[PDB]
C-alpha cells in the first residue's frame, strides 16, 4: 500500500504520523488514545481535521511522538493529520483554511530577564 | 594586609580545609571562577580586550 506520512510540531514537541486507510483507529507509541494518553477528551481536537475532510473518517493512525507535556504533544497530532489529509486530496485545503487549524502556533515559552524575578514579574517594591 | 595574604596561598596550608581560591592578577578571595583563576571584574575587563580566547557576549 501507500503510506500517508505527517509531521507534527507544537510547544517543544515533535510528532511523526503514519496514516493508512482503514476503519478509524489511533495507535500512539504502539498504544491507543486512552492507553498512552489519560482521560482527556480531545475527540474534537484530534479528529477536527476530520470535521470537513472525509467526515468523519475513517482512517487508521500510527504515530511516534515525544517531547513536552501531555497536551502539547497532543496538539502536534493536528499537524500530521491535517497535513496528511492535504497530501491525500488538495481540494480540502480551502474548507480547512477557512476554519484554519493548519498553521503552526509560533509561540512558546518566554525568555527570562536578569534582575526580574520571572520573565515579566517584578519584585514587590516598597515606596521607600 | 594583602601582600602577605597574597603569599598566604603560595605556601602549603596547615591541613586540607584552607586552600581557598582567589584571582591571580588581583587578589580578591570572593567571586573568582575556578576555571580561569580570575575574579569577577578582571575577567570582565580582559573579556572586553579580546585577549581571552573563546568568550563572546551572549544574547538570545
Amino acid at each position: 500500500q501507500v503510506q500517508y506520512s505527517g509531521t507534527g510540531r507544537r510547544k517543544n514537541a515533535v510528532a511523526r504520523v503514519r496514516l493508512v486507510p482503514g476503519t478509524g483507529k489511533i495507535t500512539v507509541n504502539k498504544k491507543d488514545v486512552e492507553e498512552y494518553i489519560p482521560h482527556a477528551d480531545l475527540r474534537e481536537v484530534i479528529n477536527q481535521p476530520f470535521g470537513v475532510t472525509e467526515t468523519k473518517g475513517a482512517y487508521d493512525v500510527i504515530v511516534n511522538v515525544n517531547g513536552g507535556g501531555y497536551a502539547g504533544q497532543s496538539g502536534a497530532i493536528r499537524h500530521g493529520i491535517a497535513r496528511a489529509l492535504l497530501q491525500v486530496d488538495p481540494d480540502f485545503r480551502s474548507a480547512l483554511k477557512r476554519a484554519g487549524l493548519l498553521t503552526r502556533d509560533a509561540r512558546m515559552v518566554e525568555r527570562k530577564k536578569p534582575g526580574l524575578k520571572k520573565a515579566r514579574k517584578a519584585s514587590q517594591f516598597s515606596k521607600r | 594586609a594583602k601582600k602577605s595574604m597574597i603569599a598566604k596561598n603560595k605556601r602549603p596550608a596547615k591541613h586540607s580545609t584552607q586552600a581557598y581560591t582567589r584571582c591571580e592578577r588581583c587578589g580578591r578571595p570572593h567571586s573568582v571562577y575556578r576555571k580561569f583563576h580570575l575574579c569577577r571584574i578582571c575577567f570582565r575587563e580582559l573579556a572586553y580586550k579580546g585577549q581571552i580566547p573563546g568568550v563572546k557576549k551572549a544574547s538570545w
Binding site: - | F36, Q51, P53, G54, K56, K57
Partner: protein
C-alpha cells in the same frame, strides 16, 4: 557609566581573539602564561611603539607576532637584540619559543600609538587643546572619516576636575560595521592621574 567597548561589541563578529587556541583541560596554565608574556613587553613599549601581539599555537612551538611602526628599531643591530629577547623570554616560558616581527603600517590612523604619544606630551607642559587639535588634524589628513578625543583628570594643575575633548569628522559608533579602534592611556604630571580616550573610523 553607560557606554561599552566597541572592541567588546565587535569581538567574534568582525574581528578575532588574540590567543588563537583550543585548550581542553590545560587552559589556565596557558592563560596566566600568556598574560605574563603580555606583561614582559614593557621594555619594548617604552620607546619601540608596539601595538598588538597576535599569539598563535603550534604543536609545541610558542608563536607570537608583534606589530610596531619601527621595523629597524626592534631588530636592533643585525638580529642581536631579538636574540636577547629570545634569551630573556625562554627563561620565562620554558618551551620552544619563536617570535615574529610583522611590521604594521600607517601609524597615523591607530588609537594606541597616537593616544600614547599625546599622553607623553601631556606630561611636558603642553596646551592640551592644541594637542588635541594637532592630533586630529594629523589623523584626518592621512585619510579618515572621523576622530573623537576626550581627556579627564585634574586639568591645568587646578581645582575640581573636568572631562572634555574636541572631535571632528562624522564617526558612527552605534552601528556594527565599524573596524574602529579604542585606546585608554594614563598620564600624571604631578597631580594624581589624568586619562585620555581616542576614537577613529576607517570604513567597513
Amino acid at each position: 557609566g553607560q557606554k561599552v567597548h566597541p572592541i567588546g561589541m565587535r569581538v567574534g563578529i568582525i574581528r578575532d581573539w588574540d590567543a588563537k587556541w583550543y585548550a581542553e583541560k590545560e587552559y589556565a596554565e596557558f592563560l596566566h602564561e600568556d598574560l605574563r608574556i603580555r606583561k614582559f613587553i614593557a621594555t619594548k613599549l617604552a620607546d619601540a611603539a608596539v601595538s598588538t601581539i597576535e599569539i598563535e599555537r603550534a604543536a609545541n612551538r610558542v608563536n607570537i607576532s608583534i606589530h610596531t611602526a619601527k621595523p629597524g628599531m626592534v631588530i636592533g643591530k643585525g638580529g642581536s637584540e631579538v636574540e636577547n629577547l629570545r634569551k630573556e623570554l625562554n627563561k620565562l616560558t620554558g618551551k620552544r619559543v619563536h617570535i615574529n616581527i610583522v611590521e604594521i603600517k600607517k601609524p597615523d590612523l591607530d588609537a594606541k600609538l597616537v593616544g600614547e604619544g599625546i599622553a607623553r606630551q601631556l606630561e611636558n607642559r603642553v596646551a592640551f587643546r592644541r594637542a588635541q587639535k594637532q592630533a586630529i588634524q594629523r589623523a584626518m589628513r592621512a585619510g579618515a572619516k572621523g576622530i573623537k578625543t576626550q581627556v579627564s583628570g585634574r586639568l591645568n594643575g587646578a581645582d575640581i576636575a573636568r572631562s572634555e575633548g574636541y572631535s571632528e569628522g562624522t564617526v558612527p559608533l552605534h552601528t556594527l560595521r565599524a573596524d574602529i579602534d579604542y585606546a585608554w592611556e594614563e598620564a600624571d604630571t604631578t597631580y594624581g592621574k589624568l586619562g585620555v580616550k581616542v576614537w577613529i573610523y576607517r570604513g567597513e
